[PDB]
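Technical annex B. To support the medicinal chemistry partners, we prepared a structural model of the target in complex with 2-acetamido-2-deoxy-beta-D-glucopyranose, based solely on the information shown next.
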Amino acid sequence: HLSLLYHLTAVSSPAPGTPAFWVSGWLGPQQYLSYNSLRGEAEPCGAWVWENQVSWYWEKETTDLRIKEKLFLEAFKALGGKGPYTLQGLLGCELGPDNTSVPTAKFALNGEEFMNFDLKQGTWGGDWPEALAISQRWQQQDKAANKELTFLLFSCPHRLREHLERGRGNLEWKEPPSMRLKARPSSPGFSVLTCSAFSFYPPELQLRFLRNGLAAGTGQGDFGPNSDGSFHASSSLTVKSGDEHHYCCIVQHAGLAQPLRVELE
Amino acid sequence: IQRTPKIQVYSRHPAENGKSNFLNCYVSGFHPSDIEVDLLKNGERIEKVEHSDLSFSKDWSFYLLYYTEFTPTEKDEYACRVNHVTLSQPKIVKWDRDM
Ligand SMILES: COC(=O)c1c(-c2cccnc2)nc2ncnn2c1-c1cc(F)cc(F)c1
Ligand SMILES: *[C@@H]1O[C@H](CO)[C@@H](O)[C@H](O)[C@H]1NC(C)=O
């Protein structure tokens, strides 16, 4: 954080109507980019459509991902066999504490991390024979290692700084959650208390339960996105029936000036 | 490897009877990426349902958001029906309005 990360996926037997290869691009927790092999164009997402960009910004994104499309689809040929295969890549960068770029280049096969790009040697490496086979295929493709080096060491940090400058407001966005605390009957003698946080950003948020002002744990929680890129969270706690009104929930979130106490409805 | 999906169902804003809203079915943690998701209204499949891109987490498992515009009422029940290779039958998860 704040990272610029590309999430790349290829599948060797895509379902009809779905892409063999697709990419989502992320600025921290926000999706800024979409790309798939059926359309062949990198596109901005959401608020980033209105970002003021340098000339040829999205043309350069498209060029880079078309190259990665070919490389990913070529990787299946190096494995042979029927499969099916999923190849994933996590490529990108983040600014370190001394304001320089820190690269990320990891890959997984059928959900298992198995390969990385070594930026010192400029080579793909991994212990599995599948890693060696794909590495060798990529390593002997015309200047693919050099383009990967440039993508990670130059293009990514340049793009990240551009977005940090031109989209600073989008990334500093703070929307406080709407809160609800409700109880429902459960097993005999027991109720489930649920504290829910609606439509907030950034995603970092804490929910805590109190029983008579005293800490009663965090409960069992989960979190997810909404369709606009805001977020949702909830935490639930099993309590004794008839004891529900001794409890409250506390939320901590950057959109709020102080932790907010939430009382039972 | 295969990983079975976690399934969450929640609205975008707190549910208020008669006020337009969005109902979300968030599926996450699954592998491989082929997945089928339907939103149900009192058991009937909802036609006008949209979805995010298929993305994935640091642990490489995929996630995906399905959503539909809706107006909750006192008696209408909603659910999310998910099929995936890890499942012996489609899993149905009812929307808990509290969640
Ligand atoms: C339908 O769009 C989304 O749901 C969405 C978008 C968005 C918003 C507007 C336009 N285009 C993309 N931006 C986001 N930023 C963080 N989450 N998020 C979700 C999201 C994105 C995914 F790739 C997977 C997922 F499960 C949820
Ligand atoms: C980080 O580096 C960029 C590019 O050189 C510069 O514009 C920015 O001011 C730096 N941030 C600091 C020094 O805090």
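Notes passed to the chemistry partners:
Chain A has four helices and 16 strands.
Chain A has two domains: 1-172, 173-263.
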